[PDB]
């Protein structure tokens with residue numbers, strides 16, 4: 001409350017609720033750390049003096065760069081100067097900070113999901129220290145070495161589906177599955193960015209605002225008339241197209257302009273079966289076109305997709 005301390009998920013959530021309930025006062029540290037990732041100095045965790053914070057920007061070279069709708073804050077690369085340990089840092093202001101920004105990552109832990117290390121308030125900014133992938137993002141790999149080979153896609157898709165299956169079993173819709181939100185580790189691929197993620201109360205989720213990245217959006221998400229976890233499956237299909245072609249589903253056929261109409265194009269023409277790569281196995285084609293299925297009730301679950309012939 002007055003200083004940064006080590007705590008539980010309960011301590012973390014109690015702090016998040018207090019922040020959501022005064023500028024010009026001396027900036028003092030306060031918050032809860034779930035993991036001991038910041039080296040203390042004189043019995044304090046002084047992130048302003050001991051944590052190296054630099055903006056984390058991705059170099060986009062293909063128009064494969066879409067700003068997420070309803071997104072807030074900034075992504076920074078945080079590094080504890082003493083241990084030289086790298087972490088991701090989601091910087092959110094006090095007024096915009098609410099308990100949903102941490103709830104998913106703090107309560108639901110899985111191998112294919114990025115771990116939440118803690119939340120530190122310093123002045124007017126709340127710092128969300130998270131697990132970082134030492135091997136970069138899927139987008140970085142695509143922009144660097146070009147379109148991915150089928151075996152490399154199968155390896156990533158197997159890991160992504162395990163993380164989706166987990167979140168979908170806990171009734172959580174990720175809402176932003178894109179190559180930039182899938183990162184590489186030494187033995188796995190992990191899902192990041194839980195800012196747009198919601199926990200489902202009932203069988204159908206009714207959004208108040210249109211949130212997410214437009215090119216990977218399903219036809220039911222654009223409509224805002226209700227959707228479920230199946231929305232993430234369409235987005236996976238859209239990322240699968242991005243992985244094998246080097247560009248997301250609609251960008252090539254319908255170029256980028258100051259007057260875009262992608263929400264209309266997806267609604268009138270989805271699934272993007274024309275954007276699927278010409279040189280891909282019949283099994284892999286079958287996997288993509290089923291995940292892009294127009295009707296969410298006829299689209300497979302993450303558990304069904306893991307059992308597919310292409311992956312095995």
Ligand SMILES: c1ccc(-c2cc3c(cn2)ncc2ncn(-c4ccc5nc(NCCN6CCOCC6)sc5c4)c23)cc1
Nearest residue numbers: 056071072073074075088131132133136137180183192193
């Ligand atoms: C939120 C919190 C943490 C991460 C994150 C990124 C990682 C990582 C672990 N975690 N491990 C390795 C890695 N190699 C590159 N990246 C990387 C770096 C920056 C980056 N920015 C992205 N999006 C820009 C849009 N912002 C707008 C504000 O709201 C959030 C989204 S995706 C993205 C991905 C990463 C991502 C988002």
